[PDB]
Amino acid sequence: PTDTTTYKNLQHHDYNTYTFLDLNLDLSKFRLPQPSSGRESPRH
Amino acid sequence: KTSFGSLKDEDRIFTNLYGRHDWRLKGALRRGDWYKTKEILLKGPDWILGEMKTSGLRGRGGAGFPTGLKWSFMNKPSDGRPKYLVVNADEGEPGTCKDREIMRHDPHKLVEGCLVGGRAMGARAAYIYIRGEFYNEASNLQVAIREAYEAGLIGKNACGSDYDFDVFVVRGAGAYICGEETALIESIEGKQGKPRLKPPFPADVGVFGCPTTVANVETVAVSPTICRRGGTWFAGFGRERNSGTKLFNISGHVNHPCTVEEEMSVPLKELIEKHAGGVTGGWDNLLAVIPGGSSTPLIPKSVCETVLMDFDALVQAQTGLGTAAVIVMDRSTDIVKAIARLIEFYKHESCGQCTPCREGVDWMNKVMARFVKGDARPAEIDSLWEISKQIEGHTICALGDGAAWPVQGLIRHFRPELEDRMQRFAQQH
Amino acid sequence: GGALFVHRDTPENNPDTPFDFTPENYKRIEAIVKNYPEGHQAAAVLPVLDLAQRQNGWLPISAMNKVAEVLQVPPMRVYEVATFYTMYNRKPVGKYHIQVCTTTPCMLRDSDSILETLQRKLGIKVGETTPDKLFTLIEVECLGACVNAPMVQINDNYYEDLTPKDIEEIIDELKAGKVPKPGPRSGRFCCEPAGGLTSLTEPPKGPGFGVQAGL
Amino acid sequence: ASNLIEVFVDGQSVMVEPGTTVLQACEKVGMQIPRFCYHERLSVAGNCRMCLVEIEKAPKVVAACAMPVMKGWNILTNSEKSKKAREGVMEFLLANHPLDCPICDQGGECDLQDQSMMFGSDRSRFLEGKRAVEDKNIGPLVKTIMTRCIQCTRCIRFASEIAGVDDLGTTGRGNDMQVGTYIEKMFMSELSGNVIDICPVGALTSKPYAFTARPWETRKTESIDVMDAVGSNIVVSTRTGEVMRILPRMHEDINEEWISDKTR
Ligand SMILES: Cc1cc2nc3c(=O)[nH]c(=O)nc-3n(C[C@H](O)[C@H](O)[C@H](O)COP(=O)(O)O)c2cc1C
Ligand code: SF4
Ligand code: SF4
Ligand code: SF4
Ligand code: FES
Ligand code: FES
C-alpha cells in the first residue's frame, strides 16, 4: 500500500550542474571491456 | 472485434505514468518489472522475436514498421563486429511527451527492454541517445542504471544469464533531425546530425560502422512486458494488423490536456472527451485536429467523429498516426498561422544536406507567411502543392515529407480560408 | 543574422582566450571517452563540448580548439558540431538563459502572453541580454512539454503550465538569488489531467501478474 | 558468370559487377545521368538529389550515385517521374542562386547552366527574396563567392580525402548552411587549385584567371607539365596568341584529374 496522493519524483529538484557526468564516472566501475577496431583512429 | 475503446488498469502497461509511485527499483519490482528476466534471457532470441511478431507490435517512432521483422533483420551470425542497440529518446515532434514521462517515471522498464532487445539482436550494449533538454530525465535514467548495475541485472552476468550487457546514455544537444535512425547514429559518432542514405541499412553497417537497430523508448519498454504476459494478449487489443496499448498525448485547445494509454483503433472523439475534458467550447467549436504529431496532415471536424485512432484508419483519412499526439484546434484559431509556425519549425530543424528540404522548406515558410498576411494570389496555392510534391519523395529523410504534408492537409481542407484572406488583402490593397 | 556561423577574432573570443579544463573535468572526459570503443574517441565531441560549456558557461573558439587537442580531432570537426547544434552557446549568455517555446501546441495556449510578460519584466527584447548579465531570452521549438503548456526552460530546468502571474513570481525569485521548483505551476504535478486521474486511480497489480505459463 | 549480373537500362541489357551503381550502368550503356555532387574520385554523398531515376515497378526514385544495382532492375532515365524530379531539383537549386552569370567566370562552362537547359524548366515561380553569404578569403589562388554554392560538398571531400587538410566543412544547418571555414584561414596546399575544377558553380574560382576570358574564346591545346618530372597531362587554353590558363587533362595512370598549384 501507499499514499497515491503526491509525487514521488521530487529528487530532480536537487540535481547539480554536473550530476549526469558524475554518475557516468561512478558508473564506469561496472562498464565492460570495449571493442577495438584495430587502430587508434582513421588517422584523419 | 469491435468497440476497442476502454482499457482496464489490469492491462495498462505503464503503471507509474503520473509519478504516483517510486520510480526507483523498489517500485519497479513491486509493480512487475525485473521479474523472470533470467528466464526471458535463457529462452532463445528467436522466441523473443516470435513474441514481438505474434504481438503485432508496430513501432511508435512515427512510422508504422513491425519490430519483429525489423529486429529479425539483425538476428544473423556475427562477422567479428560488435552489434549494438540504439534507443531513440529525442522526442522533438511537437505534441509528444510520452517518452519524457517514461524516462522520468518508469525507467527500469526501458532498461529491461534494452536488455531484452539486446539478447534478441545479439547486441553488446545499449546506447540511449536522449534529448539534451532532458537533463533531469537523463539523470534519473543514470540513477536507475546504477541501481541495476549494483543489483546485477546488467553488466557482467545480467541477472545470472552468462549474457553481458551494458547501457550507455547519451545527450543530444538539441536537434530534432537527430531523431532519425541515421542522424541519431551520426550524432553519437560525433559528426553533425546529418542523416545518411539507405542502403546501407543500420543492420548491415550502422553506428561505429557496425550492425545496429534503432528503436523507440516505448517499443523497448513494452518488449519485456510482452515477452512476459504474451504477444497474443497484446494482440487482443486493437485491430488485426495494428494492435497494442498505445500512449496518447492530447494537447492544445483542450481543457484537460493529458497523457494516456488506451486500446489502439479507439474512436478519437471518445479518446478526447472521456480522458480529457473535451475541447474548450464543445465538440461543435472544434475546427480541426492533428491526429499524430506536426508531421501529420490535418483532418477537420467532419471526419474526426467516425475516425479510429490507429494507423490504417488515419491513412484512409489522408493522414497518419505518427506518435499519437492529438493536437486540437477550435474555431478561434488562425489555422494558417499554426501551420505556418509548423513550417517555420521544420525550417529551423532542417539539417541542410539535401536540396529539396533545404531550399523548398524556407520557400514554403515564406509563402505561408505571405498566405497568413494574404499578400498572395490564389493561383499560388497549386504552386505550393507542386512544391510540396517535389519535396515529398525526393529527400534523404522524412522531414521533407513532414514539412510537405501539413501544407497538403491545409490546402485539402481549408483552401477557402486562404482565398478569403487573399480577397480581404486585395480589398485593403 | 544573430546566428552568423562565422567567427571573426576579438579580444574576448580569440585562440589565446584563457580556457582550460579542470582536473575533475579531465576525469569526467576520460570516463566519457571510455563510453565509446577504443578506436572511436571522436564521438565524445558533443558531451565534452557541452561539458566545457557548463564549466565556462559558453563556448569560445579556444574551448573548441582545446576539446580537439584533447580528443586529437581537427578543430573544424568541432566548429561544425558547435554551429550545427543550438544548445551550444558561442556568445556569452546570462546567469539564467530563458528558452520560451512558441510552437503551436504551446502557442495555441497563449504563449505569446508569456513572451511579452518576459519582454516587459526584464526590459529586453526577444533575443537580447540584460545589463546585469543575468537574464537572456530567446524563442525556441517544442521542448517535449506540449501538454503542460505554456512552458519555458531556464538552465536545465522546466517550468510548465504557467501564466503571467507565475512567470512574474519566477522572475522575482531568480532576482532574489533563489532557484524555484521545476514543474507545473497549476495543481497537477505532471501530465496527469487537471480534473483528476482518469486512467490509473486503481492500485498496480505487482509481480507475477498476467505472466504467461511456460515462462 | 564471374559474379556479374544482368540489368536493363530502358530495355537494353548490360552485365555489371556487384556493388555497381545505377549511374555506372547507365554509363556502361552510354547514358550520362545528371550530377552536382558525384565526381568519380570522391566519397559518395546523396546531397544534390539530381541523380534521381525511377526503377520500373517502383513507387519512388532512387539516387543513382549511391544505390547499388540489383538483378533484373530496369532503369528509366527518360521517363516522366525522372524528368519531373530533375525539374524540381533545378527549381530548388536556382531559387537562391544569384543572377551573376555575366560576372561569373564559370559562365559558358557551368554545369548548372547546361543542366538547367537540358534537364530543367525554363521558368521561375520563385516570387520571394533570395539569400546572400559573406564571402570568405582562403588565399591568393582561390576566390570564394559563396552566394553561388549549391552545397555539394566536393570541396570538403576533396580536401579531406585527396589533399588531407580537413579544414573545410559546413557551418550551420538548414538554408543558412555556410560551407567553408569557421575562421579566417588560408587554404594553401599544393593540391588546392583543383577545388576550382570540381566546384561546378563558380563559387570557387581562380583569382589570376579572374575575368580574363570566356571558355568559348579559348583554343585548347593538349600538352604536358614540366615543373615536375611526373609528366602531368594538361590543356593549355589560349586566346589570340596568349596563354590564358593551364587546365588539367585526364590520365588515370598519372594525374587522374589533378595538378599542382605550381603547374597551373
Ligand atoms: C525528422 C525525424 C524525426 C524523428 N524523431 C523521432 C523521435 O523523436 N522519436 C522516435 O522514436 N522516432 C523518431 N523518428 C523516426 C525514426 O525513424 C526512429 O528512429 C524509428 O522509427 C524508431 O523505430 P520504431 O519506430 O520501430 O520504434 C524521426 C524521424 C524523422 C525523419
Ligand atoms: S530532408 Fe531536410 S533534414 Fe532531411 S536530410 Fe534533407 S535537408 Fe536534411
Ligand atoms: S563551394 Fe563549390 S565544391 Fe564546395 S560545396 Fe559549394 S558548390 Fe560544392
Ligand atoms: S554558377 Fe553557373 S548559374 Fe550560377 S551564376 Fe555562375 S554561371 Fe550562372
Ligand atoms: S510545443 Fe511547446 S513544449 Fe511542445
Ligand atoms: S549526384 Fe546523387 S545526390 Fe548528387
Q: List binding-site positions of C for [2Fe-2S] cluster.
A: 101, 106, 142, 146
Same domain, C109 and C51: no
* Chain D residues in contact with B363 (beta carbon < 8 A): 92, 95, 126, 128
Q: Using an 8 Å Cβ cutoff, are C193 and B276 in contact?
A: yes
**Distance from residue D21's CA to the centre of ligand 6 (Å):** 12
Q: How many angstroms separate the Cα of B94 from the Cα of each of B336, B353, C162?
A: 17, 23, 19
What is the number of alpha carbons within 13 Å of residue A9 lying toward its C-beta? Answer: 26
Q: CB pairs below 8 Å between B and C: how many?
A: 227
Q: Using an 8 Å Cβ cutoff, are D156 and D179 in contact?
A: yes
Residues contacting B283, CB < 8 A, separation 6+: B269, B273, B301
Distance, in Å, from the CA atom of C44 to the CA atom of D104, rounded to the nearest integer, reads 42
Q: Is B422 left (phi over 0), alpha (psi -120 to 50) or beta?
A: alpha
Instruction: Cell numbers for B202, please give them.
Output: 543500420
Instruction: Cell numbers for D264, please give them.
Output: 597551373
Q: How many angstroms separate the Cα of B73 from the Cα of each of B67, B77, B212, B288, D62?
A: 10, 11, 10, 40, 22
| Experimental method of this PDB entry | cryo-EM
Backbone angles phi, psi at B328, to 5 degrees: -110, 135
Question: Using omega within 30 degrees of 0 as the cis cutoff, is the peptide bond preceding B200 cis?
Answer: yes
Distance, in Å, from the CA atom of C93 to the CA atom of C64, rounded to the nearest integer, reads 17
Residues B355-376 as b/e (b if ≥16 CB within 10 A, e otherwise) read bbbbbbbbbbbbbbbbbbebeb
- Side chain identity, residue B20: R
Strand partners, B216: B88
Helix axes C76-84, C61-71, angle to 10 degrees: 120
Q: Please tell me if the CB atom of residue C167 comes closer than 6 angstroms to any atom of ligand 5.
A: no
Q: How many angstroms separate the Cα of C164 from the Cα of each of B253, B282, C125, C185?
A: 18, 26, 17, 11
Q: Compare CB distances from A40 to C24, C39, C156 and report the shortest one's residue.
A: C39
Sole residue written with cell 496532415:
B297
Q: Please tell me if the CB atom of residue D244 comes closer than 6 angstroms to any atom of ligand 6.
A: no
Closest CA to B18 of B227, B196, B259, B238: B259
H/E stretch holding C78? helix C76-84
Three-state helix/strand/coil letters over chain B: CCCCCCCCHHHCCCCCCCCCCCCCHHHHHHHCCCCCHHHHHHCCHHHHHHHHHHCCCECCCCCCCEHHHHCCCCCCCCCCCCCEEEEEECCCCCCCCHHHHHHHHCHHHHHHHHHHHHHHHCCCEEEEEECCCCHHHHHHHHHHHHHHHHHCCCECCCCCCCCCEEEEEEECCCCCHHHCHHHHHHHHHCCCCCCCCCCCCCCCCCHHHCCCCEEEHHHHHHHHHHHHHCHHHHHCCECCCCECEEEEEEECCECCCEEEEEECCEEHHHHHHHHCCCECCCHHHEEEEECCCCCCCCEEHHHHCCCEECHHHHHHCCCCCCCCEEEEEECCCCHHHHHHHHHHHHHHHCCCCCHHHHHHHHHHHHHHHHHHHCCCCCCHHHHHHHHHHHHHCCCCCCHHHHHHHHHHHHHHHCHHHHHHHHHHHHHHC
Q: Is residue C2 part of a domain?
A: no
Q: Using an 8 Å Cβ cutoff, are B243 and B57 in contact?
A: yes
Distance, in Å, from the CA atom of D9 to the CA atom of B273, rounded to the nearest integer, reads 57
Q: In what order do the strands lie in the sheet with B84-89?
A: B166-171, B125-130, B84-89, B214-216
Closest CA to B90 of B16, B170, B23: B170
Question: Using omega within 30 degrees of 0 as the cis cutoff, is the peptide bond preceding B416 cis?
Answer: no
Q: Is residue C205 part of a domain?
A: no
How buried is C34 (Cβ within 10 angstroms: 0-12 exposed, 13-18 middle, 19+ buried)?
middle
| CA torsion, ordered B138, B139, B143, B146, to nearest 10 deg | 70
Sole residue written with cell 571517452:
C33
How buried is D211 (Cβ within 10 angstroms: 0-12 exposed, 13-18 middle, 19+ buried)?
exposed
Helix axes B45-54, B107-121, angle to 10 degrees: 120
Residues contacting C90, CB < 8 A, separation 6+: C7, C58, C59, C60, C82, C83
Q: Locate breaks in chain C with C to N over 2.5 A; list the residue preceding each.
A: none
User: Which of C49, C87, C104, C202 best tests the B interface by mutation, with the highest count of B CBs <10 A?
Assistant: C104
**By alpha-carbon position, which residue is closest to atom 8 of ligand 2?**
B351
Helices (H) and strands (E) in chain A, counts: 1, 0
Q: Is residue C158 part of a domain?
A: yes
- Determine how β-strand D233-238 pairs with β-strand D243-248: antiparallel
H/E stretch holding C61? helix C61-71
Same domain, C102 and C154: yes
Range of the domain at C40: 19-92
Q: How many angstroms separate the Cα of B182 from the Cα of each of B179, B202, B207, D96, D133?
A: 8, 8, 8, 28, 29
Q: Please tell me if the CB atom of residue D53 comes closer than 6 angstroms to any atom of ligand 6.
A: no
**Distance from residue B294's CA to the centre of ligand 1 (Å):** 13
Chains that touch A (3 or more CB pairs under 8 A): B, C
| Nearest atom in ligand 3 to D158's CA | 3
Q: Where are the beta strands (DSSP E) in chain C?
A: 96-101, 135-140, 151-154, 157-160, 183-184
What is the number of alpha carbons within 13 Å of residue D25 lying toward its C-beta? Answer: 33
Distance, in Å, from the CA atom of B279 to the CA atom of B416, rounded to the nearest integer, reads 24
Distance, in Å, from the CA atom of C146 to the CA atom of C163, rounded to the nearest integer, reads 15
Per DSSP, C28 falls in state H
Q: Is residue C13 part of a domain?
A: no
Helix axes B107-121, B135-151, angle to 10 degrees: 60
How buried is B75 (Cβ within 10 angstroms: 0-12 exposed, 13-18 middle, 19+ buried)?
middle
Closest CA to C60 of C84, C79, C74: C79
Apex C67 CA angle, C63 and C71, nearest 5: 170
Same domain, C71 and C153: no
- Side chain identity, residue B47: W
Closest CA to D212 of D235, D239, D194, D192: D239
Three-state helix/strand/coil letters over chain D: CCCCEEEEECCEEEEECCCCEHHHHHHHCCCCCCCCCCCCCCCCCCCCCCCEEEECCCCCEEECCCCECCCCCEEECCCHHHHHHHHHHHHHHHHCCCCCHHHCCCCCCCHHHHHHHHHCCCCCCCCCCCCCCCCCCCCCCEEECHHHCCCCCHHHHHHHHHHCCCCCEEECCHHHCEEECCCCCCCCCCCCCHHHHHCCCCCEEECCCCCCCCCCCCEEEEEECCCCCCCCEEEEEECCCCEEEEEECCCCCCCCCCCCCCCC
Q: Please tell me if the CB atom of residue D153 comes closer than 6 angstroms to any atom of ligand 3.
A: yes
Q: Using an 8 Å Cβ cutoff, are D170 and D153 in contact?
A: yes
Positive or negative, the CA dihedral D197, D202, D207, D211 is: positive
Question: Using omega within 30 degrees of 0 as the cis cutoff, is the peptide bond preceding C150 cis?
Answer: yes
Check CB contact under 8 Å for A27 and B138: no
As a residue count, chain D comes to 264
Same domain, C133 and C194: yes
Same domain, C100 and C154: yes
Strand partners, B85: B126
Residues D102-114 as b/e (b if ≥16 CB within 10 A, e otherwise) read eebbbeeebbbbe
Same domain, C97 and C85: no
Closest CA to B298 of B424, B170, B144, B408: B408
Q: Using an 8 Å Cβ cutoff, are A35 and C38 in contact?
A: yes
Check CB contact under 8 Å for B146 and A27: yes
Residues contacting B10, CB < 8 A, separation 6+: C205, C209, C210
Distance, in Å, from the CA atom of C3 to the CA atom of C83, rounded to the nearest integer, reads 8
H/E stretch holding C47? helix C45-56
Residues contacting D79, CB < 8 A, separation 6+: D54
Check CB contact under 8 Å for A18 and C28: yes
Q: List binding-site positions of D for [4Fe-4S] cluster.
A: 97, 101, 104, 110, 149, 152, 155, 199
Same domain, C128 and C140: yes
Distance, in Å, from the CA atom of C72 to the CA atom of C75, rounded to the nearest integer, reads 9
Closest CA to B403 of B393, B412, B413: B393
Distance, in Å, from the CA atom of B317 to the CA atom of C129, rounded to the nearest integer, reads 47
Residue A14, number of CB atoms within 10 A of its CB? 9
Instruction: Cell numbers for B265, please give them.
Output: 483503433
Q: Using an 8 Å Cβ cutoff, are B93 and B179 in contact?
A: yes
Same domain, C105 and C120: yes
- Side chain identity, residue D103: I
Per DSSP, C158 falls in state E
Mutation choice for ligand 1 from B65, B67, B71, B88, CB with most ligand atoms inside 8 A:
B88
Backbone angles phi, psi at B327, to 5 degrees: -95, 125
- Side chain identity, residue B19: G
Strand partners, B248: B260
Same domain, C143 and C71: no
Q: Name the domain count of chain C.
A: 2
**Distance from residue D91's CA to the centre of ligand 6 (Å):** 16
**Distance from residue A28's CA to the centre of ligand 2 (Å):** 36
Apex C97 CA angle, C96 and C98, nearest 5: 110
A1 SS3 class: coil
